[PDB]
Write an enzyme that holds these catalytic residues in place. Structure first.
Site, PDB file in Angstrom:
ATOM      1  N   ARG A 124       0.906  -1.159   0.000  1.00 41.14           N
ATOM      2  CA  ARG A 124       0.000   0.000   0.000  1.00 41.14           C
ATOM      3  C   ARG A 124       0.938   1.200   0.000  1.00 41.14           C
ATOM      4  O   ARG A 124       1.962   1.108   0.676  1.00 41.14           O
ATOM      5  CB  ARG A 124      -0.875  -0.036   1.274  1.00 41.14           C
ATOM      6  N   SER A 162      -7.950  -1.319  -0.017  1.00 36.11           N
ATOM      7  CA  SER A 162      -9.154  -1.591   0.802  1.00 36.11           C
ATOM      8  C   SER A 162     -10.072  -0.393   1.162  1.00 36.11           C
ATOM      9  O   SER A 162     -10.539   0.260   0.244  1.00 36.11           O
ATOM     10  CB  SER A 162      -8.672  -2.310   2.055  1.00 36.11           C
ATOM     11  N   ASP A 185     -17.008  -2.032   2.416  1.00 36.44           N
ATOM     12  CA  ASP A 185     -15.787  -1.293   2.237  1.00 36.44           C
ATOM     13  C   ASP A 185     -15.424  -1.330   0.720  1.00 36.44           C
ATOM     14  O   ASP A 185     -15.960  -2.086  -0.103  1.00 36.44           O
ATOM     15  CB  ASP A 185     -14.618  -1.886   3.118  1.00 36.44           C
ATOM     16  N   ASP A 207     -13.275  -2.677  -1.195  1.00 36.22           N
ATOM     17  CA  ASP A 207     -13.066  -3.828  -1.992  1.00 36.22           C
ATOM     18  C   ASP A 207     -13.943  -5.033  -1.723  1.00 36.22           C
ATOM     19  O   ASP A 207     -13.648  -6.139  -2.153  1.00 36.22           O
ATOM     20  CB  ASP A 207     -11.547  -4.093  -1.873  1.00 36.22           C
ATOM     21  N   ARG A 231     -15.498  -6.447   3.738  1.00 37.86           N
ATOM     22  CA  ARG A 231     -16.042  -6.022   5.039  1.00 37.86           C
ATOM     23  C   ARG A 231     -17.440  -5.415   4.923  1.00 37.86           C
ATOM     24  O   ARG A 231     -17.834  -4.896   3.888  1.00 37.86           O
ATOM     25  CB  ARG A 231     -15.044  -5.027   5.751  1.00 37.86           C
ATOM     26  N   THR A 264      -5.121 -11.275  15.012  1.00 39.06           N
ATOM     27  CA  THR A 264      -5.925 -10.661  14.001  1.00 39.06           C
ATOM     28  C   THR A 264      -5.263 -10.975  12.666  1.00 39.06           C
ATOM     29  O   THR A 264      -4.059 -11.252  12.635  1.00 39.06           O
ATOM     30  CB  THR A 264      -6.007  -9.137  14.167  1.00 39.06           C
ATOM     31  N   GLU A 271     -14.332 -11.139  12.862  1.00 34.72           N
ATOM     32  CA  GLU A 271     -13.460 -10.127  13.424  1.00 34.72           C
ATOM     33  C   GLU A 271     -14.345  -8.933  13.773  1.00 34.72           C
ATOM     34  O   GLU A 271     -15.332  -8.674  13.068  1.00 34.72           O
ATOM     35  CB  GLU A 271     -12.390  -9.618  12.449  1.00 34.72           C
ATOM     36  N   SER A 287     -13.639  -5.893  13.666  1.00 39.85           N
ATOM     37  CA  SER A 287     -13.457  -4.782  12.731  1.00 39.85           C
ATOM     38  C   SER A 287     -14.322  -4.980  11.475  1.00 39.85           C
ATOM     39  O   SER A 287     -13.799  -5.002  10.356  1.00 39.85           O
ATOM     40  CB  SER A 287     -11.972  -4.700  12.381  1.00 39.85           C
ATOM     41  N   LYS A 314     -12.355 -12.526   3.229  1.00 36.63           N
ATOM     42  CA  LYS A 314     -13.624 -12.218   3.879  1.00 36.63           C
ATOM     43  C   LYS A 314     -14.592 -11.744   2.777  1.00 36.63           C
ATOM     44  O   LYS A 314     -14.156 -11.269   1.706  1.00 36.63           O
ATOM     45  CB  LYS A 314     -13.468 -11.085   4.912  1.00 36.63           C
TER      46      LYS A 314
HETATM   47 MG   LIG Z   1     -10.992  -4.477   2.572  1.00 42.64          MG
END
Ligand SMILES: [Mg+2]
Length: 561
Positions: free
Chosen positions: A22, A116, A287, A289, A292, A356, A375, A377, A388
């Site tokens: 990133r 993300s 989110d 991508d 989440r 995590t 998770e 988050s 995920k």
């Molecule tokens: Mg993401």
């Protein structure tokens, strides 16, 4: 086209993390050969002999510079001998759709151009992530290899004249000068393989009934101008029939419409303002991508992500995939609440608590010992893929609403009434000075390790908390052998409550202290209150044993989730 060899000079900083490399968009576009050496370093990890028959899935989240980094991958992968690249149409492919396609076509791996929930646009962030043959993120061993190569790299091969129309479905073939086999690029509908996978996991006839009938469920799905927008329109509106105003911010934008595609109450405040009115029965946000998600019931009722994984776990046989698969095990990251543990113990299914991150979940899923994981988050997933999946958690909630025929709030009150409530909150202290924050962690751990800490009692209104166990979490992975230490300090109390401290930002000028409070309440008189009021006694005990104010000068957290 001709294959050209370009001499380059290596960079010192290209070390891919668990989320790949990133970096701010201007670094990729202003540092000569930054992107070109990283992409050549990824491809170099595929043995030259295995490349002609190999296939690489390439896709991203729609953000700025994505189209430009995809043409670069095509040029380098072509000149390096990769036989084929399967690319989502227009470059678009959510992270769960890249995991689905690698596994489906037996691709060697995939390159995901996503940073993300981070910002996109001329000023945002850009990310290059590599997933491997099981459809999951490349492990340390492999990101390390990429790191080594990127720092000692002297040359890269590129076909500079190759350009591909990403907007066109189908096969494109190119001949490379004097070479005997052509390079092939297959553009693919962004949504189809992923929706055919979901059509097999869930029951779409029950979901069509739930969303398009006379007496339908009214939903509002906010995709935050990110990659999940096309998946929501084609699966939820077009196939399942929800009204077109059920889908909001469903057009991918290069800057995510000037906002951060991060699913929580204040970043997705818009969707929470719409929910306050009382019109819809269900709401959700995703989110950037698609891995989440945030779940909201009527009037804005927030379903905590630690409670969301425990509700799907307690109602998992309401989904066809698990009736056919059987439930192989449950798992949560350590700081996530104990709500899922209550369901795993009641149900008698093994519960694994891991550091995590996805890797510990991938390992267990590949060992056939994990079916559902979560998770705190905003993360939820199952072994259907090896990332995920945000929309999957929304269809698992809709299947539980169709089957149960009760509102989101009644499902939760009913769950808390059967299992007890794990009131939960996450406190983030954001640019803490690092010497003060480390000293805070080192001193609390010296205190915790005293031979008389276990047994110690604490109180701050009615209840007394008795320390049952106290440690600096360590995990020994049963699958790849690794030993992870220093994962977080835990004061575990005999009633089921816990206080957890992690210094995520450990070092830069700045440090990040995440403090997680998990308070178990079984009294049917206390389970319905505001969590900040119910967690106030344990939050006081946490600030006091840690001397956090004294150590950091902070009187309040930056963010409360
Ligand atoms: Mg993401």
């Amino acid at each position: 086209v001709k294959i050209v060899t370009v001499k380059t000079k290596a960079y010192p900083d290209q070390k891919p993390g668990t989320s790949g490399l990133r970096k701010r968009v201007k670094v990729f576009q202003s540092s000569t050969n930054y992107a070109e050496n990283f992409i050549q370093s990824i491809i170099s990890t595929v043995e030259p002999a295995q490349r002609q028959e190999a296939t690489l899935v390439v896709g991203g989240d729609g953000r700025f510079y994505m189209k430009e980094a995809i043409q670069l991958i095509v040029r380098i992968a072509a000149a390096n001998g990769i036989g084929r690249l399967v690319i989502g149409q227009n470059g678009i492919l959510s992270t769960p759709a890249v995991s689905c396609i690698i596994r489906k076509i037996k691709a060697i791996g995939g390159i995901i151009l996503t940073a993300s929930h981070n910002p996109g646009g001329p000023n945002g962030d850009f990310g290059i992530k590599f997933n491997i043959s099981n459809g999951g993120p490349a492990p340390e061993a492999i990101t390390d290899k990429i790191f080594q190569i990127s720092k000692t790299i002297e040359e890269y091969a590129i076909c500079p004249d190759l350009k591909v129309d990403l907007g066109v479905l189908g096969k494109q073939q190119f001949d490379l000068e004097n070479k005997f086999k052509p390079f092939t690029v297959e553009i693919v509908d962004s949504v189809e393989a992923y929706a055919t996978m979901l059509r097999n996991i869930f029951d779409f006839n029950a979901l069509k009934e739930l969303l398009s009938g006379p007496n339908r469920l009214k939903i509002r799905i906010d995709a935050m101008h990110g990659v999940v927008g096309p998946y929501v329109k084609k699966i939820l509106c077009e196939e399942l029939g929800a009204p077109a105003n059920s889908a909001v911010n469903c057009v991918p934008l290069e800057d995510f419409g000037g906002h951060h595609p991060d699913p929580n109450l204040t970043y997705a405040a818009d969707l929470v303002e719409t929910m306050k009115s009382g019109e819809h029965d269900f709401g959700a946000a995703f989110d950037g991508d698609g891995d989440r998600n945030m779940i909201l019931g009527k009037h804005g009722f927030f379903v905590n992500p630690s409670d969301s994984v425990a509700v799907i776990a307690a109602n998992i046989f309401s989904i066809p995939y698990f009736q056919q698969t059987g439930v192989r095990g449950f798992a949560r990251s350590m700081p996530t609440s104990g709500a899922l543990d209550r369901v795993a113990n009641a149900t008698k299914i093994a519960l694994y608590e891991t550091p995590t991150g996805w890797k510990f979940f991938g390992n267990l899923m590949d060992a056939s010992k994990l079916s559902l994981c979560g998770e705190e988050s905003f993360g939820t997933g199952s072994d259907h893929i090896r990332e995920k999946d945000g929309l999957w958690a929304v269809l698992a909630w809709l299947s539980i609403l169709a089957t149960r025929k009760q509102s989101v709030e009644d499902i939760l009150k009913d769950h808390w009434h059967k299992f007890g409530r794990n009131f939960f909150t996450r406190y983030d202290y954001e640019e803490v000075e690092a010497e003060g924050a480390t000293k805070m962690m080192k001193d609390l751990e010296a205190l915790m390790f005293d031979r008389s800490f276990v047994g110690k009692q604490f109180s701050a209104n009615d209840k007394v908390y008795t320390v049952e166990k106290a440690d600096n979490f360590e995990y020994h992975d049963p699958v790849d052998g690794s030993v992870s230490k220093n994962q977080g300090l835990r004061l575990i109390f005999a009633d089921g409550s816990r206080i957890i401290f992690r210094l995520s930002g450990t070092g830069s000028a700045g440090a990040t202290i995440r403090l997680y409070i998990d308070s178990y309440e079984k009294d049917n008189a206390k389970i319905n209150q505001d969590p900040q009021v119910m967690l106030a006694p344990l939050i006081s005990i946490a600030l006091k044993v840690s001397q956090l104010q004294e150590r950091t000068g902070r009187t309040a957290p930056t963010v409360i989730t």
